[PDB]
Design a protein around this ligand. Structure first.
Ligand SMILES: Oc1ccc2c(c1)O[C@@H](c1ccc(OCCN3CC(CF)C3)cc1)C1=C2CCOc2cc(O)ccc21
Ligand SMILES: CC1=C(c2cccc(O)c2)[C@H](c2ccc(I)cc2)Oc2ccc(O)cc21
Ligand code: NI
Lengths: 234, 218
């Protein structure tokens, strides 16, 4: 019933689906070594991934797809989704990344890892950019769902063609929802289309960061297809 | 001058800036040699195209090099995908070099990138992407991919957005259809970024700033 929802019903459902903010393992050895910091971040990321699977099932349109296609979208999007979440909760802490409420890290602590500092900087710039745009929570949840639905759709017979157009219609509905929030907020038609484009252009930088992130992770714990398909069935 | 242009003047300037379609001059090496020769020749035309994108020449030479360093492969890729639209299941690298999926297997690891390029081409075919929309998307890539210089870039991007909406309104689309199509085109740019990052990784598996800064000064 995702194509029959209004803009306000889409927002309400995405806000209800929103996963909880988690904490890192309490009182680890401080200061950090390269391994210890990666261990705590990896533990946190894995626990968030369990909540992401459950979030994804409550994104309208996603559950209508086949289990194979749900796994494919999540396999393509999981690190982008982790990253936009991080960047969102770091908005109110300029020069810092709020990995958890008990794990607020500045740029200099990123140097502890080796190659992480470049990715750190990109995440901070994006956070700063969301701060400058005054990004709203309602807009945030729409952007997250876009990432999930958009990131794997291009790399997907009758079945797959019907699944692809279904995804494209859901994305059209999220666009409508984004415009409605901006019109309800009071922005002019010109300001609405400009802000929409600004938000969607930021998603290309998020993809870039996610690809750099993967390369950095493989240089040193990444969810496989089989792992994600096991988790989805539960 | 770029902030004072109308939607129609933006389109006319981008269409005038458009580079020419070039010709090429198999083993894994021989195919990569011909593709690399072609890519290098197109890169000379891209530098000159970039200088004629309204807003780009106002930036410093350092910032022009940075935008091009970040965007060159995305720009090469959207060009390829655009000229392949009318050849389903094939990539038109040049008019004398039309390659299907199976010839991508000749170079190891290329076939995955081949597939992504074909899917994007197919997606532009399904959207009935227009030449006027294409040139706007290309300029977006250049300006978006890489304090007064930053806000200048953001204003130029706002003008290209306006231009995109105007083309859709002039084409007859409703306000709802206009914002949906705008979003659809911009979402495709994330896949182009992805392809470009995969492309780089693949290129470094086989094989600069200074080179691009040298070319820009000419
Ligand atoms: O006209 C075209 C249009 C598209 C392409 C194309 C030619 O050829 C090649 C190509 C060759 C060399 C390059 O870079 C070589 C290195 N350059 C020269 C500088 C070093 F001195 C950087 C860059 C690209 C090509 C495409 C498709 C998109 O990008 C690719 C990704 C791949 O994984 C494999 C091949 C390509
Ligand atoms: C973005 C990110 C990580 C990250 C990854 C690469 C580079 C970087 O700077 C940060 C790193 C991470 C570590 C291990 C895995 I498996 C996945 C993410 O730790 C995180 C924890 C929570 C979260 O919401 C995001 C991240
Ligand atoms: Ni509108």
């Amino acid at each position: 019933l995702a194509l029959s929802l209004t803009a306000d019903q889409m927002v309400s459902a995405l806000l209800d689906a929103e996963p909880p903010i988690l904490y890192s393992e309490y009182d680890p050895t401080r200061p950090f070594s390269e391994a210890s910091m990666m261990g705590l971040l990896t533990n946190l990321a894995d626990r968030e991934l369990v909540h992401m699977i459950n979030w994804a099932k409550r994104v309208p349109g996603f559950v209508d797809l086949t289990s194979h296609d749900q796994v494919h979208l999540l396999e393509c999007a999981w690190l982008e989704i982790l990253m936009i979440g991080l960047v969102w909760r770091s908005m109110e802490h300029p020069g810092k990344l709020l990995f958890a409420p008990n794990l607020l890290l500045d740029r200099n602590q990123g140097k502890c890892v080796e190659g992480m500092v470049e990715i750190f900087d990109m995440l901070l710039a994006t956070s700063s950019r969301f701060r400058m745009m005054n990004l709203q929570g309602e807009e945030f949840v729409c952007l997250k769902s876009i990432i999930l639905l958009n990131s794997g759709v291009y790399t997907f017979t009758l079945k797959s063609l019907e699944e692809k157009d279904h995804i494209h219609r859901v994305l059209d509905k999220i666009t409508d929802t984004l415009i409605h929030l901006m019109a309800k907020a009071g922005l002019t038609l010109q300001q609405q289309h400009q802000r929409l484009a600004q938000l969607l252009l930021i998603l290309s930088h998020i993809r870039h960061m996610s690809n750099k992130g993967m390369e950095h992770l493989y240089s040193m714990v990444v969810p496989s297809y089989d792992l994600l398909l096991e988790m989805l069935d539960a």
